[PDB]
Amino acid sequence: KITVPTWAEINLDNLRFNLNNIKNLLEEDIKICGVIKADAYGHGAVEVAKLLEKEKVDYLAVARTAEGIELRQNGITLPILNLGYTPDEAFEDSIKNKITMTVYSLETAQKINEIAKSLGEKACVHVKIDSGFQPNEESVQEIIELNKLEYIDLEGMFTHFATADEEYTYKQANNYKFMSDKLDEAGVKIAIKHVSNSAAIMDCPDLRLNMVRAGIILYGHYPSDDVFKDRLELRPAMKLKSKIGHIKQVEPGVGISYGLKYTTTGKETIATVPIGYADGFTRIQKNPKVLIKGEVFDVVGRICMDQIMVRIDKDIDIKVGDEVILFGEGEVTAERIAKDLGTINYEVLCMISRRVDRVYMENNELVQINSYLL
Amino acid sequence: KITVPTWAEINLDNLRFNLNNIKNLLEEDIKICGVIKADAYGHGAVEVAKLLEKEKVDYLAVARTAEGIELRQNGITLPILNLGYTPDEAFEDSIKNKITMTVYSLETAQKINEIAKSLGEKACVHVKIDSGMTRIGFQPNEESVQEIIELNKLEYIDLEGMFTHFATADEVSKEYTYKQANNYKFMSDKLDEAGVKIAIKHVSNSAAIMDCPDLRLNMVRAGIILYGHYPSDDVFKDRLELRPAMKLKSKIGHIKTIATVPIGYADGFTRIQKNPKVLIKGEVFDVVGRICMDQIMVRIDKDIDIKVGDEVILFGEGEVTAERIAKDLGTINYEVLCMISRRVDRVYMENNELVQINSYLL
């Protein structure tokens, strides 16, 4: 029923579990924006969006106009915020698809306004403060003007923390206050003020404002080791899986894979797994591992584009087509791969390729298989 | 008419340039297999495949059944070979879609034969020999010869082909490569003796194609070279002149001197990079700070007057190359190419005009 040899299994109940724990943290009056940029950090933005919709979150965030359109094309009705850059030639598509756009300057708000005027639609925007608009009086007047524009709905105001996962944050926090304050003095309403990312949500309870932006934590992962984990319980939602393609006993003294960078010592059982660097299992890894029936085993030799080799050095019952876990259970994790790489968990999650089908589970049953090729 | 902030421009003319130069290497009767696995090494398998049909190659090679099916769904009619593993669950789809399957055990062949019999269709297979890569395939011994002899008897199987793959054909020393070919020859000779016919015999990859003209046999497998890239720095690059086909591009989004560019690690411009660079207006600039998920910051330290929307080239022009990122990362050009994410639209060019845009999202 899964006909692909390598897939990403996404447990939807884990997303629910994570979100419910997030919600416990917050007062009822604080809105949640689920951050689903970069294909929901590799989990599949459309399917994740559908779930978030069921679960009644308030906003969804994306990084690209297309990511938003993709959502509209799939029946998503929630408000959507493009956190990232909107190029000028995409203003109209945004307005037509009801994508809230982030704006950094008065000038650009004016461009947007003119476009919405011709569509006869008010364009919803959030203003970004860089703590974007510098936090100063000159900007304060700029916004006051922006708000005058006939075809702009200035719904939101936000900033983003550099270091909430490690206070500089609270410096950044000050600047935004300087903003929120001056704008109040002037009666500019701003329905949604938001500043909190995942780390802030966790460590910084004073920073709830009108909404929080929940990203890495929705997926079941921590933004760093530093945050108060004790605070929030998480379950990772993705498992990268494969099957055993082949097995053989290799004689001693035999090179394996390209460049022959691993040489057998002793007669070794070697398994071949149909996952590679083109799947997002990067060649860069110095110490790659897999989980097979509760055991970790080393990946040996260079990682190929579509295949890897594994030394089975334990007694276990295995055959061709047995399941292999690459990350998300036991001791194989995205954090571990990330640490070996010298990068972060977010990146490992994002790397997972186009050809890797997302298989959605719910109530421990497979409910949906998404192919990006077919 | 491009609406995305970051895109991959694929120059079809360059694919043609590469292919023709590859053809010039070869005598008339040697078959060409175009290797388009991993979405044609990030270039877009469907479009590349269409180009290959138009230019008339003999075979297409994929790594997964689904890769084969995608091509069929877009009207590709050339023979397609799945180089690697086909799991049991995909046998029927393979047969129905005329995806030729790599086989390396009699047992799987028997299973394939059964599914095929039930469909009432013959399955096409190529036999893989493990000659020293130690990856997949039959060990090169007599027991395996017998096994193949038996396989050949299966009524619902067409044993079309037999191949191996070199571990080291791109290195300066060819000794292992020749050793691997010797291992293949033993099998080929023994089977010939036993009367197993075998139409398409193949061993050569891009490096073998370049460096080993004595290894043509029936067919050669061209991959990285198709895309205008060398397999290593050690091949005889003077034999084959190549043009890279892909340019990864963005445009300047914001300026303050630091330009912010809306490309990030999520696009496959990896964070791991310690010396990331970009090309703007003919000059190279440093990417500063950490690479973000969706953007990077660039330092403009020269006086050409960049403005918002000027083009930024990540690789494929001038001094910014896939190889240069690869050097930095301790990987290879193949991986950098494969890295480009689903959200990065593939924009196809020909005669310096845009002829097609593919969105993987919309």
Residue numbers in the entry:
A (entry chain B): 3 to 133, 139 to 173, 177 to 384
B (entry chain A): 3 to 258, 279 to 384
Copy the relevant paper text.
Alanine racemase (Alr) is a pyridoxal-5′-phosphate (PLP)-dependent enzyme that catalyzes the reversible racemization of l- and d-alanine. Since d-alanine is an essential component of the bacterial cell-wall peptidoglycan, and there are no known Alr homologs in humans, this enzyme is being tested as an antibiotic target. The structures are prototypical Alr homodimers with two active sites in which the cofactor PLP and cycloserine are localized.
Uniquely, the CdAlrPLP crystal structure is a tetramer, while the other two structures are dimers. Each dimer is structurally similar to the homodimers of CdAlrK271T (r.m.s.d. of 0.288 Å to one dimer and 0.361 Å to the other) and CdAlrcycloserine (r.m.s.d. of 0.397 Å to one dimer and 0.511 Å to the other).
